[PDB]
Write a protein that binds this ligand. Structure first.
Ligand code: HEM
Ligand code: HEM
Ligand code: HEM
Ligand code: HEM
Lengths: 141, 145, 145, 141
């Protein structure tokens, strides 16, 4: 479903994100927790105050799992298989919540890369993030 | 239906928003990222790719028109259903747009504001806009809730 | 708000529904077919497999309460927003369920009805009944959207 | 995707339908049209009332296609490729409508096989009709 054009744009734009992924990952979480209050019942063990160390720390982890995803686009189901388990079977995270992070994530990348966030790149990234979500919700047992 | 302090931040921000190009960008992006919505606008001519869509004068015109009614409901935040009731009937009864799409246009709207306004599109400020878009979306869904 | 012939066809039907067995199955089904909803009911016990859920007394016990309030939702149909107002409080402010699952349960309800009442549950009577579940769902997710 | 367990369950269910397949896809269609009016607009060239030759007709097409899928569970991408193209690219069906015809089908099945529509079978079908959906909406560029 990811065309050649999509593979490149994600690669290109994520490469653009560079050493800032961590910071963006925390920004996407923030705006998620802030825009959609439900998402918080999954982190009642976090300090969710603006600027939290824990959030920043979780920002990186999410950011890192996306870098890893961007690198191994050919095999996502097998790159993120562990994550599918944790999130779906162990944490029982509602799938709709995946739509939402994806969104804040796109709001965040839009924010920080206006010149590089073109309709066609937006398009490709959305497809990327919906795919990472599809994989994450696949193991519902 | 948004605590006073929330209408304040939103309406105050909204004056800085050039409605003409946010409109155009919003609507074009919807048709590119969500290719099935194209079915509704095929009377606008060539939408075969994102250059034809983004440059198509008629998408550009409809963008302003859409955000103009948006920017109008912004002055009636306590009565969204009221304002959009008419436009509900068009979209729901004459056009047959599935309500999930109103929410998709709100979300893309949000993304564009982000792109135009930088770190001024603060996390707190977005939260308020998320409440503004779901509200409009419901208003519009109305004529069959 | 409802052709008072629909309203009648719905009540007319409702009054022969074995509400407690319809209640136990719908809930059991939701937790099986959509497991992430199990997160809210792991205080109910062993939910490992299809039988374990269908035989779980606490489950069966609760779905009866769920179909009870759907039941008394039936006798107050043009008011609804308010019949459900404080259960919205509950789910959407204490328990924190995404509104999507009210629609999901409402659709499990429908399928259980058809399985129970076979060829009585005609395309018509269903359409009428979807408007209802859609209504119970929209009215529940009030404390937010 | 589907465990060997899901597959037997789908295989046997559709199996037990036998030659009322076109009968039930017709009904599925009907129930969808009445329940969710917005879906009618993809058939402006149909007569949408009961017993309509046209619906009966279209029901045999859908059902036949689902039969082919049941035949080929391990490769739907392949087997459905030509239908993904028509529904996504040519016909522009809103993906949400795939969720609705699926619901229609379950109701339909539930309603002719109350005996055989166990919660286990129920789950397995639902997961199956979702894969079908995912494939019918993938060729979306
Ligand atoms: C693109 C989507 C997502 C990705 C890539 C992702 C990634 C990750 C990673 C890498 C971990 C921890 C692995 C480790 O520490 O060893 C994790 C844990 C977790 N995730 Fe996600 N996540 C995503 C979406 C979500 C969503 C939507 C939620 C729920 C709102 C969520 C909730 C959690 C929770 C509650 C944890 C465990 C918290 C903890 O470690 O204490 N994730 N996720
Ligand atoms: C926030 C949500 C929306 C708002 C506020 C909105 C507003 C409007 C307005 C102001 C018009 C034109 C009526 C006039 O000429 O005065 C319109 C027409 C139209 N809208 Fe929307 N709309 C929304 C969502 C959508 C969506 C999601 C779609 C489909 C994907 C859609 C499809 C159409 C179509 C096809 C027309 C008719 C275009 C024409 O031929 O003039 N709208 N809408
Ligand atoms: C038709 C939609 C629904 C109705 C009418 C409904 C109704 C009810 C009722 C009557 C109660 C119990 C109040 C009492 O015991 O006095 C309840 C509690 C509860 N509901 Fe729902 N509910 C609905 C949907 C849902 C959904 C979709 C979920 C999540 C998947 C959910 C999760 C819960 C939970 C976790 C409780 C607490 C029960 C306990 O502590 O054991 N509800 N609901
Ligand atoms: C799993 C679900 C579905 C399957 C297996 C399926 C399968 C088919 C098949 C076999 C055809 C006949 C194509 C041909 O004869 O060349 C068709 C056509 C068509 N389908 Fe679907 N379909 C599904 C869902 C949908 C949905 C949800 C819609 C939207 C409401 C839809 C709309 C259409 C339309 C408008 C046609 C063209 C028929 C005509 O113009 O004569 N389909 N589909």
């Amino acid at each position: 479903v990811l065309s050649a054009a999509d593979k490149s744009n994600v690669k290109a734009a994520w490469g653009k994100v560079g050493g800032n992924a961590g910071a963006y990952g925390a920004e996407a979480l923030e705006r998620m927790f802030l825009s959609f209050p439900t998402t918080k019942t999954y982190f009642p063990h976090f300090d969710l105050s603006h600027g939290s160390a824990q959030v920043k720390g979780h920002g990186e982890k999410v950011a890192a799992a996306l870098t890893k995803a961007v690198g191994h686009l050919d095999d996502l189901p097998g790159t993120l298989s562990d994550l599918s388990d944790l999130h779906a079977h162990k944490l029982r995270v509602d799938p709709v919540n995946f739509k939402l992070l994806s969104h804040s994530l796109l709001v965040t990348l839009a924010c920080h890369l206006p010149n590089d966030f073109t309709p066609a790149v937006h398009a490709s990234l959305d497809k990327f993030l919906a795919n990472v979500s599809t994989v994450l919700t696949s193991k519902y047992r | 239906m948004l605590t006073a302090e929330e209408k304040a931040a939103v309406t105050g921000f909204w004056g800085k928003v050039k409605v003409d190009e946010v409109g155009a960008e919003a609507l074009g992006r919807l048709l590119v990222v969500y290719p099935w919505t194209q079915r509704f606008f095929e009377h606008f001519g060539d939408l075969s790719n994102a250059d034809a869509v983004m440059n198509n004068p008629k998408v550009k015109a409809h963008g302003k028109k859409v955000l103009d009614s948006f920017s109008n409901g912004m002055k009636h935040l306590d009565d969204l259903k009221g304002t959009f009731a008419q436009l509900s009937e068009l979209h729901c009864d004459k056009l047959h747009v599935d309500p999930e799409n109103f929410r998709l246009l709100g979300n893309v709207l949000v993304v564009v504001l982000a792109r135009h306004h930088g770190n001024e599109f603060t996390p707190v400020l977005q939260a308020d806009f998320q409440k503004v878009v779901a509200g409009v979306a419901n208003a519009l869904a109305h004529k069959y809730h």
